[PDB]
């Protein structure tokens, strides 16, 4: 009943050149949108240049947006600026953002609300890092993150959740399918228990944090796991078998 | 006998139509581009429309650039990335990053030194608070800023500075052609002390706060501004009568 959902997220990645060669990889694997999403996510800059070049079967977004609206935001993409783009999906929250850029559960929440406002699909990712997992304290972080934002979902088709265990983003350490779908579980419970039963049931709760060729199907598998967060591997011609294992 | 230089900051602002219509008033104007640089600084998702709808006299750049290179670092833009798409400048420092998103002195030097690194050209920001000038700390201030990045630069036709007074943005207090021509001079005079008097002489130094068709002849005028960096007067077709006053 959930429609799955592969996303490639390429970060800060690419040139006019690989772009095109890896688009017409892609272009290859002929695949039904009103079955499956696929969703490609390039830098802000690449956006025209990779929509063009992607079939429409795929879909296409940017890797974050502005907590404001239009206005005096220097550097800032704002959700309104996407939507009269026609941009259909944004990321929020990566964990590189929050790291990096010290962004906030309550930047996401704004995000969120900005993104919803404008009638954008938002991709909203959170998870615990490594201290917090050894500490046990792994359901009481998720609980946390996912509550900043969660009640702001008006259409839990256009809302899209991402677990991220921080450990296992760019690492090659990926959660074991148990691990992930013990955690997505407890996600989709949370969803049930704020939202509603019906809610959580039709919400996509993707996995990400190294996943590849070798372990998407094991993934997919999983009852609550609906789909990945692709990073690097997504930067390969290879990202096709990913979506396969979705298919 | 230095090159005049007037850009546009969007900001966070503009659709697909206002852009068409705002880039069409532009190229009537006919100007000089080996006399005067006219560069404009859409949203990075606008780029690719902007560049395409002005003519070749208009210069153009994107309002901010990353610290880190190309990889894990979702929602950045790379100088490296930049350079690939021949975007020929970028605005670091610019004060809505500073205040909203806390960059830096140091941020700001590691995106130049990744601007230049990359052949890229920059418009660096600064200024000081209402409270900084009224406890009489403008000097000492615009010294540590310009101090945190003036040494990077190796052509000084390449790397622009802005004088952007934030005592004089949402305040009261308004800025004059004088006092803001004192804190160009003393500008100046920190690159004459750090990199030498003919490239103190061959920098270009902006004015920085609000800049509209009343005011900008008045600044221009003064001897040690150059051109500016203009905001919401920018966003209109009028903003061709900025541009006149540096030709």
Chains 1, 2 share one sequence.
């Not at 490609?40 to 502005?66: A, C, E, M, W």
């Not at 009269?84 to 969120?112: P, S």
């Not at 609980?143 to 265990?165: R, S």
């Not at 955690?183 to 939202?195: A, G, L, Q, Y």
């Amino acid at each position: 009943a959930r429609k799955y959902f592969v996303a490639a997220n390429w970060k800060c990645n690419g040139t006019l050149e690989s772009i095109k060669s890896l688009t017409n990889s892609f272009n290859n694997l002929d695949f039904d949108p009103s079955k499956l999403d696929v969703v490609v996510f390039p830098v802000s800059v690449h956006y025209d240049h990779t929509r063009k070049l992607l079939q429409s079967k795929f879909s296409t977004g940017i890797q974050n947006v502005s907590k404001f609206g239009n206005g005096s935001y220097t550097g800032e993409v704002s959700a309104e600026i996407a939507k009269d783009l026609n941009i259909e999906y944004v990321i929020i929250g990566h964990w590189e953002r929050r790291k990096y850029f010290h962004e906030t559960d309550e930047d996401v929440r704004e995000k969120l609300q900005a993104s919803l406002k404008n009638n954008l699909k938002a991709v909203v990712c959170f998870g615990e890092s490594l201290e917090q997992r050894e500490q046990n304290k792994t359901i009481e972080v998720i609980t946390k993150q996912v509550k900043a934002f969660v009640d702001l979902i008006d259409n839990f088709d256009n809302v899209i959740l991402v677990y991220e265990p921080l450990w296992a983003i760019g690492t090659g350490k990926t959660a074991t399918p148990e691990q992930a779908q013990l955690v997505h579980k407890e996600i989709r419970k949370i969803v049930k228990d704020t939202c509603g039963e019906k809610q959580a049931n039709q919400i996509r709760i993707l996995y990400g944090g190294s996943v590849n060729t070798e372990n998407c199907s094991s993934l997919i598998q999983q009852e609550d796991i609906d789909g990945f967060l692709v990073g690097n591997a997504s930067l390969k011609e290879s990202f096709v078998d990913i979506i396969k294992s979705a298919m």
